[PDB]
């Protein structure tokens with residue numbers, strides 16, 4: 502199965518990506534070398550809804566799962582709608598270890614309804 506996903510380590514400064522799937526490299530047009538150690542916000546740009554970024558920030562703060570749809574940009578500046586699902590990952594002792602982020606490319610929710 503095709504899986505667009507990244508794993509971040511929230512126990513390192515600014516939640517860096519420590520793993521990016523082949524499909525994530527393909528979608529975003531970045532090499533693994535350009536992604537590893539970055540915060541995933543580098544995919545955002547002018548058209549990204551700051552209200553949606555806020556919802557993600559709060560979900561990471563409270564270590565809660567969330568799904569949002571937001572505008573991201575490939576290396577070559579191509580806009581794509583990203584249906585982004587965030588999942589906290591806890592160790593055996595219930596301590597946060599990682600976040601996993603799974604991307605789906607597509608305008609799943611029409612922009613006119615998303616904007617409401």
Ligand SMILES: Cc1cc2nc3c(=O)[nH]c(=O)nc-3n(C[C@H](O)[C@H](O)[C@H](O)COP(=O)(O)O)c2cc1C
Pocket residue numbers: 507508509516540541542544545554555557558561571573583585587600601602603604
């Ligand atoms: C595992 C994981 C995957 C993420 N994937 C994306 C993504 O694909 N696109 C995106 O815009 N933001 C993504 N983010 C969110 C940003 O890295 C950042 O948390 C968000 O923009 C809110 O924080 P900020 O306001 O400090 O940027 C992801 C976050 C995590 C933890």
